[PDB]
Amino acid sequence: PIFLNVLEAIEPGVVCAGHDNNQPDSFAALLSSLNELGERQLVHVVKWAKALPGFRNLHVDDQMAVIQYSLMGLMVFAMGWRSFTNVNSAMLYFAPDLVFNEYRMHKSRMYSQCVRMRHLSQEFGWLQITPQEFLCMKALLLFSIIPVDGLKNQKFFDELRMNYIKELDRIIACSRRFYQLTKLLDSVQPIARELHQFTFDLLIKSHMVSVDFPEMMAEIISVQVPKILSGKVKPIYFHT
Ligand SMILES: C[C@](O)(CS(=O)(=O)c1ccc(F)cc1)C(=O)Nc1ccc(C#N)c(C(F)(F)F)c1
């Protein structure tokens, strides 16, 4: 199992947010730590992605664009999984120092999005998703959102996507399963778009609510995320 060996080997380790758990859950505090956490996870997602089989086949500009467009979905999917295996989806395990209970979910003003994510997290139990299926599905999420007008070398992207779908189909090797797993993958995207909308809004009013964005995250939110929210960049859904 060469392919699964590689996915297992490259899987990021623990990322902490740096959150002060002695201060009171304030909107500004929770969100400033979520933004810092997003930057810390991006650093790891970049190194992960670049070690993936075949990823370096993509044009270099397309490499970074694909990582940026898919970052939210990747983080959501992985956090659903951490939640499942750590706390059985009782709470959202964003990081070991940033675990959300209902109260946090309300205080962050992301309650509706958090309930979806915990629902996704519960799915990993309701479907009995294996670690190996989780890893294949996560690698496919990286190849699941692109500009409607295509990437710079779109044939190379299509080839990669095709092969990652095949690897997922093998690991399954039943048609029920593939249907379920592709439906679960599709369910990530509406959640990512809700988070994207929330994040962009927060950046625009960030001065007046006293939330800090790291530079890298501010640049992505102002350059890349609007392309998604304006419909230039859209997810690849399996269904509908
Ligand atoms: C609100 C925000 O802080 C915005 S952000 O992280 O700056 C961000 C900005 C741009 C993106 F394309 C994705 C994420 C955020 O979504 N953070 C965040 C951090 C960690 C994790 C995890 N795990 C998640 C979530 F995906 F799980 F929601 C979300």
Side-chain angles (χ1 to χ4, degrees):
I2 273 171
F3 173 75
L4 283 170
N5 278 344
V6 173
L7 297 190
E8 287 156 356
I10 67 176
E11 178 72 353
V14 173
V15 181
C16 299
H19 179 65
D20 181 351
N21 287 285
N22 317 267
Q23 247 45 78
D25 296 330
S26 65
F27 178 69
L30 290 165
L31 265 298
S32 298
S33 303
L34 278 173
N35 296 338
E36 173 68 24
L37 182 60
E39 181 153 271
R40 293 179 178 194
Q41 294 190 191
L42 171 57
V43 167
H44 294 276
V45 172
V46 165
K47 294 167 178 176
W48 172 73
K50 293 184 177 274
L52 239 20
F55 187 80
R56 296 296 192 87
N57 289 167
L58 296 172
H59 192 296
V60 140
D61 302 340
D62 286 345
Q63 293 180 31
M64 285 303 321
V66 133
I67 291 154
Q68 286 169 353
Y69 299 143
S70 78
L71 179 66
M72 194 64 82
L74 296 166
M75 290 195 303
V76 162
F77 195 65
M79 185 279 290
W81 179 257
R82 282 195 302 283
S83 306
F84 168 70
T85 61
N86 294 147
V87 298
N88 300 50
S89 331
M91 289 181 291
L92 299 181
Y93 205 96
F94 289 97
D97 57 340
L98 192 64
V99 180
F100 271 35
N101 45 26
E102 286 254 325
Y103 178 73
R104 234 107 101 130
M105 289 176 205
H106 178 91
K107 291 291 296 187
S108 75
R109 307 191 191 155
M110 313 178 71
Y111 186 93
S112 46
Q113 300 90 338
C114 299
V115 164
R116 308 195 49 188
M117 289 181 290
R118 76 127 90 79
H119 193 92
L120 196 201
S121 188
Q122 294 167 79
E123 292 282 8
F124 284 120
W126 296 333
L127 299 160
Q128 265 169 57
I129 300 302
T130 69
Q132 297 77 29
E133 292 169 327
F134 161 74
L135 290 174
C136 296
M137 290 182 285
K138 183 161 61 56
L140 228 205
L141 274 173
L142 177 62
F143 305 107
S144 291
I145 170 164
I146 55 169
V148 165
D149 279 303
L151 287 174
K152 289 186 187 177
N153 292 141
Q154 189 66 39
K155 291 164 179 202
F156 294 152
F157 173 97
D158 299 331
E159 255 272 76
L160 232 27
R161 180 183 165 83
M162 182 169 69
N163 291 144
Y164 275 80
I165 291 170
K166 255 173 199 143
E167 289 309 336
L168 173 62
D169 211 20
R170 302 220 200 131
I171 265 48
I172 283 157
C174 179
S175 149
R176 204 204 326 179
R177 189 50 179 189
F178 190 85
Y179 183 89
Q180 276 158 348
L181 296 199
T182 54
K183 219 63 187 155
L184 185 63
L185 287 178
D186 285 356
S187 69
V188 176
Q189 305 293 348
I191 301 165
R193 198 183 191 286
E194 248 180 88
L195 285 171
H196 278 137
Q197 184 69 248
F198 166 98
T199 297
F200 172 85
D201 290 347
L202 190 62
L203 179 66
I204 297 311
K205 73 192 165 191
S206 76
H207 293 303
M208 302 139 225
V209 299
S210 307
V211 169
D212 266 76
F213 288 81
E215 272 178 28
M216 210 157 60
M217 303 320 278
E219 166 177 289
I220 289 155
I221 296 159
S222 70
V223 177
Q224 305 286 229
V225 170
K227 294 185 198 168
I228 296 170
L229 291 177
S230 67
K232 301 191 166 174
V233 168
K234 286 184 183 307
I236 305 174
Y237 290 103
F238 276 102
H239 299 279
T240 101

